[PDB]
Amino acid sequence: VAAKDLRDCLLIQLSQFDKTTPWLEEARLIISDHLDLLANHDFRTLMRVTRLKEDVLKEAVNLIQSLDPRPGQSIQTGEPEYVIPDVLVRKHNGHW
Amino acid sequence: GQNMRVAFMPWNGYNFEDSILVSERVVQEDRFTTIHIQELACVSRDTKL
Amino acid sequence: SRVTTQKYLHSPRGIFELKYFFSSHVNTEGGGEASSTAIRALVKKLIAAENPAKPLSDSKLTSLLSEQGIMVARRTVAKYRESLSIPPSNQRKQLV
DNA sequence: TTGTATTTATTGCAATTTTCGTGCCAATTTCTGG
DNA sequence: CCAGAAATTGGCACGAAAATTGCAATAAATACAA
Numbered sequence: 001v002a003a004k005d006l007r008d009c010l011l012i013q014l015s016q017f018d019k020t021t022p023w024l025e026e027a028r029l030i031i032s033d034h035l036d037l038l039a040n041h042d043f044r045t046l047m048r049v050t051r052l053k054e055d056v057l058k059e060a061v062n063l064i065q066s067l068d069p070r071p072g073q074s075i076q077t078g079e080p081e082y083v084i085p086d087v088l089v090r091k092h093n094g095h096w
Numbered sequence: 097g098q099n100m101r102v103a104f105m106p107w108n109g110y111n112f113e114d115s116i117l118v119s120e121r122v123v124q125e126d127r128f129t130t131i132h133i134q135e136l137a138c139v140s141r142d143t144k145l
Numbered sequence: 146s147r148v149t150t151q152k153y154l155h156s157p158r159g160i161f162e163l164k165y166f167f168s169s170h171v172n173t174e175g176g177g178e179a180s181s182t183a184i185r186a187l188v189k190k191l192i193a194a195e196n197p198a199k200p201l202s203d204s205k206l207t208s209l210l211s212e213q214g215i216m217v218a219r220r221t222v223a224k225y226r227e228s229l230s231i232p233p234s235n236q237r238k239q240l241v
Numbered sequence: 242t243t244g245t246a247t248t249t250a251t252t253g254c255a256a257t258t259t260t261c262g263t264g265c266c267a268a269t270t271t272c273t274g275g
Numbered sequence: 276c277c278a279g280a281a282a283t284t285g286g287c288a289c290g291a292a293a294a295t296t297g298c299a300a301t302a303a304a305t306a307c308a309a
Contacts, residue, residue: 041236044271058240080143083157087163142159146294147252169261169293181261218263223284233284235270237298242309249304259294270283275276 001071013067025061026052038064049066098127171221174214184210184217185225192231200237 003009012030019025029050031037037045047057055082089096100122110117122128170178181187191209195201201209203222209219213230 041238043238043240054240061240080141080145082141083144083153083160085160086152088155090157144160146296150295167294171262204283218282220263220285221261224262227285235283243307245304245307246309247307250302254298255296256298257294257296259292261290261292264288265286265288267286268284270281272281273277273279275278 003071006069007031009069009071010064010067013071019065023056023059023063024051027063028057030060031064152210172216174211177214178231179215179217181225183213185229187213187215188222188225189229189231192226192237195237197237197239197241202234 003012011028014024014028030046034046034049035081044058046052047054050057052060107117149167152163154161154163163175165182169181171181171184173179187210192201203219203226206225206226207217207219207222210222226233
C-alpha cells in the first residue's frame with residue numbers, strides 16, 4: 001500500500017518473500033529492469049536481455065502474475081448505483 | 097424429551113439453587129444433541145454499468 | 146431524436162438507453178445489412194475463442210467474418226476492436 | 242340566423258453539426274531463406 | 276543468425292449520411308351576443 005507505481009508495489013510485495021522461493025531472483029530482475037516490454041508481451045527480447053529459457057521465463061511470469069496488483073482493494077467500500085427505467089417491456093402470453 | 101435415571105440428593109454444591117449435575121455418558125450417547133439449520137441468501141441485481 | 150434522449154428501457158436482458166437500438170450498418174453477402182452492434186458481438190465472441198499461442202489479427206478476423214456473409218473492411222474491424230478496448234494481436238499472445 | 246371573441250390544438254422545418262465506413266500510408270513487428 | 280521483405284497497426288482524410296438544435300406569437304372549433 002501507498003506505493004508510487006506498479007514497479008514499486010511489486011518490489012515491495014516481492015521483498016516479503018523468503019529467499020527459498022525457487023524463482024524469486026528472476027522475477028525480481030524482470031520487475032526491476034524490464035517491465036515495459038513485459039507489458040508489451042515481447043517474451044522474446046525478454047529472453048535475450050534476461051538470458052533465460054522458456055521453462056524458466058514462464059515460471060517467473062507466473063510468479064509475477066501471482067502477486068496482488070491492487071493492495072488497497074482488500075477493504076472494499078461503496079455501493080453499486082442503479083437507475084429507474086422509464087418504460088418496461090415484458091412477455092405476456094406469447095407476445096411482447 | 098428423554099428418559100433419565102435420576103437421584104435426588106445434594107452433590108458437593110453442584111446442584112445448588114436449581115443447578116443440574118449431568119453424567120458424561122449422557123453426552124457420549126448423544127441423548128440431547130439437536131440439529132439446527134440456517135439459511136443464507138445472495139441476490140444478484142442489475143446495475144447501470 | 147428528442148424523445149429517445151436519456152430515457153432507459155428495462156428488458157429481461159437488462160437496462161438500455163432506448164438509443165442503444167440505433168446503429169450503423171455494413172453490407173452483407175447477396176443482399177441486406179448487418180448492424181454494427183451484431184458485428185461487435187461477433188468480434189468479441191471470435192476473439193474470446195482464439196488460440197492463446199497465436200492471436201487473431203484483423204485480417205484473419207475479417208476473413209472469418211466474411212464467411213457468414215458480412216462485408217466489413219479491415220480498418221472497420223480494427224475500429225470495432227479498439228472500441229471494445231481489446232489490445233492488438235501482438236499484445237494478446239501468452240507463453241503457454 | 243350570423244358575424245365575433247375564446248379556447249383549444251400545434252409535437253415540424255431548416256439549417257448546422259456530428260458521425261459514419263473505408264482508403265492512403267508511414268511507422269512498427271514478425272517471418273524467412275539464404 | 277542477418278537483411279529484406281512481408282505483415283500489422285493506427286493517424287488522418289473524404290464525402291456521404293445521419294443526428295442535433297434553434298425557432299418566439301398561428302388556425303380552427305365553439306360558445307355567444309345582435
